[PDB]
């Protein structure tokens, strides 16, 4: 469908969008920083497709305590105006707080890549519960396949990346390979691409088990190997995954959108 008439500043062909950061990968995937996107344009494009976003979180044992703040802040900041289905995976279904949701937003509690996700959402976003949203996280992230730059490693050279370095692991990446170091959380994409990813990692991890080896950073090591060989269609800047107690608030981050809880 066509967009309506809209009034916004003209893009400036001869002005770089940012002079401080890389805003596109060498496979031409956007890297999402504040200033790169017009949110009104993007909201129109996604609303016109009647987009549903699923948000999955695991909350097991003590981690259930974090659900209240997680959901309440997602309600303020996550995909506001779009259809959202939260999927909470928990060992304690009765301890899930009753959080009031906006219209068009729903929550399922699943007691601990089901096909149920295909018929229900267009995109899946996979995060941890011990976080809170502090600023806009919206449709600018949505794409067939995305990962987020680990906040501790975005300025690192590939040699310093904590990839799995042992050739006997399926997650092995040598010193002369690697684009970015993606954090093993906050990834997502179309349901198809997310299921392909989780299926690949799950098979690689079982191969490692049979061979008596466990990757240095577990799930995250294997995510890094997957996204090296299957380039994400967007990459999110560390605005999308921050720890301000550990890392402060550098000038390169104009927004801190989704952050560790004390
Ligand atoms: Hg710009
Ligand atoms: Hg997921
Ligand atoms: Hg896995
Ligand atoms: Hg993975």
UniProtKB/Swiss-Prot annotation:
Coiled coil segments of this chain: none
Residues the record lists as binding an alpha-L-fucosyl-(1->2)-beta-D-galactosyl derivative: 150, 162, 220, 243
Any one GO biological process: lipid glycosylation
Residues at which Mn(2+) binds: 128, 130
Entry cofactors: Mn(2+)
Chemical reaction(s) catalysed: an alpha-L-fucosyl-(1->2)-beta-D-galactosyl derivative + UDP-N-acetyl-alpha-D-galactosamine = an N-acetyl-alpha-D-galactosaminyl-(1->3)-[alpha-L-fucosyl-(1->2)]-beta-D-galactosyl derivative + UDP + H(+); an alpha-L-fucosyl-(1->2)-beta-D-galactosyl derivative + UDP-alpha-D-galactose = an alpha-D-galactosyl-(1->3)-[alpha-L-fucosyl-(1->2)]-beta-D-galactosyl derivative + UDP + H(+)
Binding residue positions for UDP-N-acetyl-alpha-D-galactosamine: 58-60, 63, 128-130
Consequence of substituting residue 131 to T/V: Alters substrate specificity so that both UDP-N-acetyl-D-galactosamine and UDP-galactose are utilized
Tissues in which the protein is found: Expressed at high levels in testis. Also expressed in pancreas, uterus and lung and salivary gland.
Keyword hit for Membrane: yes
Result of changing residue 131 to R: In allele Bel01; loss of manganese binding and reduced catalytic activity
Effect of residue 208 to N: In allele B104
Effect of residue 147 to R: In group B transferase; lower-level protein expression and intracellular cytoplasmic mislocation
Subcellular location: Golgi apparatus, Golgi stack membrane; Secreted
Cofactor note: Binds 1 Mn(2+) ion per subunit.
Enzyme class: transferase
Membrane topology: Single-pass type II membrane protein
Positions annotated with a glycan in the UniProt record: 50
Record function comment: This protein is the basis of the ABO blood group system. The histo-blood group ABO involves three carbohydrate antigens: A, B, and H. A, B, and AB individuals express a glycosyltransferase activity that converts the H antigen to the A antigen (by addition of UDP-GalNAc) or to the B antigen (by addition of UDP-Gal), whereas O individuals lack such activity.
Domain notes: The conserved DXD motif is involved in cofactor binding. The manganese ion interacts with the beta-phosphate group of UDP and may also have a role in catalysis.
The family this protein is said to belong to: Belongs to the glycosyltransferase 6 family.
Protein name: Histo-blood group ABO system transferase
Species annotation: Homo sapiens (Human)
